[PDB]
Design an enzyme around this catalytic site. Structure first.
Site, mmCIF file in Angstrom:
data_model
loop_
_atom_site.group_PDB
_atom_site.id
_atom_site.type_symbol
_atom_site.label_atom_id
_atom_site.label_comp_id
_atom_site.label_asym_id
_atom_site.label_seq_id
_atom_site.Cartn_x
_atom_site.Cartn_y
_atom_site.Cartn_z
ATOM 1 N N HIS A 256 -4.851 -9.093 12.893
ATOM 2 C CA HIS A 256 -6.228 -8.589 12.724
ATOM 3 C C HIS A 256 -7.246 -9.388 13.534
ATOM 4 O O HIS A 256 -8.032 -10.169 12.992
ATOM 5 C CB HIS A 256 -6.617 -8.559 11.246
ATOM 6 C CG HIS A 256 -5.907 -7.504 10.471
ATOM 7 N ND1 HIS A 256 -4.980 -7.790 9.497
ATOM 8 C CD2 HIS A 256 -5.982 -6.155 10.538
ATOM 9 C CE1 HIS A 256 -4.521 -6.663 8.984
ATOM 10 N NE2 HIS A 256 -5.113 -5.657 9.599
ATOM 11 N N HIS B 250 -14.799 -3.348 12.750
ATOM 12 C CA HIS B 250 -14.247 -2.929 11.454
ATOM 13 C C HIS B 250 -13.442 -3.980 10.666
ATOM 14 O O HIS B 250 -13.275 -3.813 9.457
ATOM 15 C CB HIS B 250 -13.420 -1.641 11.596
ATOM 16 C CG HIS B 250 -12.003 -1.877 11.994
ATOM 17 N ND1 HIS B 250 -11.617 -2.070 13.301
ATOM 18 C CD2 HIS B 250 -10.881 -1.964 11.248
ATOM 19 C CE1 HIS B 250 -10.311 -2.263 13.343
ATOM 20 N NE2 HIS B 250 -9.840 -2.205 12.110
HETATM 21 C C1 LIG Z 1 2.673 -0.116 11.215
HETATM 22 O O1 LIG Z 1 2.826 -0.957 10.067
HETATM 23 C C2 LIG Z 1 1.713 -1.230 9.320
HETATM 24 C C3 LIG Z 1 0.425 -1.095 9.761
HETATM 25 C C4 LIG Z 1 -0.661 -1.331 8.890
HETATM 26 N N1 LIG Z 1 -1.928 -1.159 9.391
HETATM 27 C C5 LIG Z 1 -2.920 -1.373 8.530
HETATM 28 N N2 LIG Z 1 -2.868 -1.757 7.250
HETATM 29 C C6 LIG Z 1 -1.589 -1.953 6.740
HETATM 30 N N3 LIG Z 1 -1.500 -2.442 5.438
HETATM 31 C C7 LIG Z 1 -1.002 -1.589 4.359
HETATM 32 C C8 LIG Z 1 -0.500 -2.462 3.241
HETATM 33 O O2 LIG Z 1 -1.531 -3.312 2.737
HETATM 34 C C9 LIG Z 1 -2.068 -4.133 3.777
HETATM 35 C C10 LIG Z 1 -2.569 -3.316 4.945
HETATM 36 C C11 LIG Z 1 -0.408 -1.715 7.548
HETATM 37 C C12 LIG Z 1 0.938 -1.862 7.119
HETATM 38 C C13 LIG Z 1 1.973 -1.648 7.984
HETATM 39 O O3 LIG Z 1 3.296 -1.905 7.710
HETATM 40 C C14 LIG Z 1 4.093 -0.855 7.147
HETATM 41 C C15 LIG Z 1 4.743 -1.346 5.877
HETATM 42 N N4 LIG Z 1 5.840 -2.273 6.129
HETATM 43 C C16 LIG Z 1 6.813 -2.661 5.280
HETATM 44 N N5 LIG Z 1 7.681 -3.591 5.561
HETATM 45 C C17 LIG Z 1 8.496 -3.831 4.461
HETATM 46 C C18 LIG Z 1 9.514 -4.784 4.397
HETATM 47 C C19 LIG Z 1 10.244 -4.928 3.224
HETATM 48 C C20 LIG Z 1 9.985 -4.121 2.125
HETATM 49 C C21 LIG Z 1 8.969 -3.177 2.167
HETATM 50 C C22 LIG Z 1 8.228 -3.040 3.336
HETATM 51 S S1 LIG Z 1 6.900 -1.970 3.670
HETATM 52 MG MG LIG Z 2 -8.991 -3.811 7.572
HETATM 53 ZN ZN LIG Z 3 -8.081 -2.698 11.246
#
Ligand SMILES: COc1cc2ncnc(N3CCOCC3)c2cc1OCCNc1nc2ccccc2s1
Ligand SMILES: [Mg+2]
Ligand SMILES: [Zn+2]
Length: 323
Positions: A78, A116
């Site tokens: 970020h 943002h």
């Molecule tokens: C392209 O990825 C992302 C991009 C994002 N962009 C913005 N905000 C996000 N978050 C959303 C969540 O709360 C904080 C903010 C993002 C989360 C992302 O990751 C996808 C989720 N990954 C997982 N990895 C594992 C590993 C083991 C078990 C379960 C999982 S779920």
């Molecule tokens: Mg944000």
């Molecule tokens: Zn953002």
């Protein structure tokens, strides 16, 4: 408030954008990563093309950007890089749907994308609330997202930084509601309710784009579509951006493990193996539904869904043992 310097402003004002990029920037898949030195210049250009050349006084605009950059911390994801990434997708969305939006919404949204995630600490809203952080006390929900708008305004109030000097107080208070709504909307907690309603609007054909509640919802989604646009890039860029993301997630998990508390599987570096499956869930639960509904409402944004599906197949392959 971290203020910028003059030699930064003098170098950026004498910035051309190379003519090979003039075509490339316009495309949705464009990856800014390889042009770090050109990002403040790239955003000036993007503001210039979308809102017209003589729109902001370029002394102020250039001054506003380098302080926005200084108020992004060095953290895995970020960061200043991310902000400019998010701003480009908005530029591409706005360019390919121009007259659908207004001067003040185009000027407002581009700035708001750049602002943002201002002063992001590499910490999610869950964390800050789970440990009773000062910011979570002042902002009960959308914790970081309100602080980002608070920070966006703080920069505007600085000496010769108010790029909305030539706006009437009417226009000035209009533009700050576009920005605030846009910046709050990047809170994924809200997206899910936002997308659900916009699909129900869309399916029972009653979305009206000059219906004011629908604008803010449609713009709300666009910010989500912009925030998540690492998934809309070419496959290698995405795999690289996913690392940057998880490095910030696992950083947050390490702090929990110091405090003796199990972090969620997303933020555990000792659950690297579930990364392939975790992306797949985010793509099906979030990304695909985000860009499907966006493409439905703004059909010129179809290349976002296109590339999102390409990168879904890639994560599908990684779980199927064909990386
Ligand atoms: C392209 O990825 C992302 C991009 C994002 N962009 C913005 N905000 C996000 N978050 C959303 C969540 O709360 C904080 C903010 C993002 C989360 C992302 O990751 C996808 C989720 N990954 C997982 N990895 C594992 C590993 C083991 C078990 C379960 C999982 S779920
Ligand atoms: Mg944000
Ligand atoms: Zn953002």
């Amino acid at each position: 408030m971290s203020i910028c310097t003059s030699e930064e402003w003098q170098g950026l004002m004498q910035f051309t954008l190379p003519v090979r990029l003039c075509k490339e920037i316009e495309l949705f898949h464009f990856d800014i990563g390889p042009f770090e030195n050109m990002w403040p210049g790239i955003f000036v250009y993007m503001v210039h093309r979308s809102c017209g050349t003589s729109c902001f006084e370029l002394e102020k605009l250039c001054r506003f950007i380098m302080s926005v950059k200084k108020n992004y911390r060095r953290v895995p994801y970020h960061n200043w890089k991310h902000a400019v990434t998010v701003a480009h997708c908005m530029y591409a969305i706005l360019q390919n749907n121009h007259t659908l939006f207004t001067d003040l919404e185009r000027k407002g949204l581009l700035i708001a994308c750049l602002c943002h995630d201002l002063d992001h600490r590499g910490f999610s809203n869950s964390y800050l609330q789970k440990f009773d952080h000062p910011l979570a006390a002042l902002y009960s929900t959308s914790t970081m997202e309100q602080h980002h708008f608070s920070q966006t305004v703080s920069i505007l109030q600085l000496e010769g930084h108010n790029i909305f000097s030539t706006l009437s107080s009417s226009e000035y208070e209009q533009v700050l509601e576009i920005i605030r709504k846009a910046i709050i909307a990047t809170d994924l907690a809200l997206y899910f309710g936002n997308r659900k309603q916009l699909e129900e609007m869309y399916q029972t054909g009653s979305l009206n784009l000059n219906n004011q509640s629908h604008r803010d919802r449609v713009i709300g989604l666009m910010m989500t579509a912009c925030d998540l646009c690492s998934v809309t890039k070419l496959w290698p860029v995405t795999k690289l951006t996913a690392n940057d993301i998880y490095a910030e997630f696992w950083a947050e998990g390490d702090e929990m493990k110091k405090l003796g508390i199990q972090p969620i599987p997303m933020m555990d570096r000792d659950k690297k193996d579930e990364v392939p499956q975790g992306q797949l869930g985010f793509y099906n639960a979030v990304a695909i539904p985000c860009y499907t509904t966006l493409t439905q409402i703004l059909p010129p944004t179809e290349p976002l869904l296109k590339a999102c599906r390409d990168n879904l197949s890639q994560w599908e392959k990684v779980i199927r043992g064909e990386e």
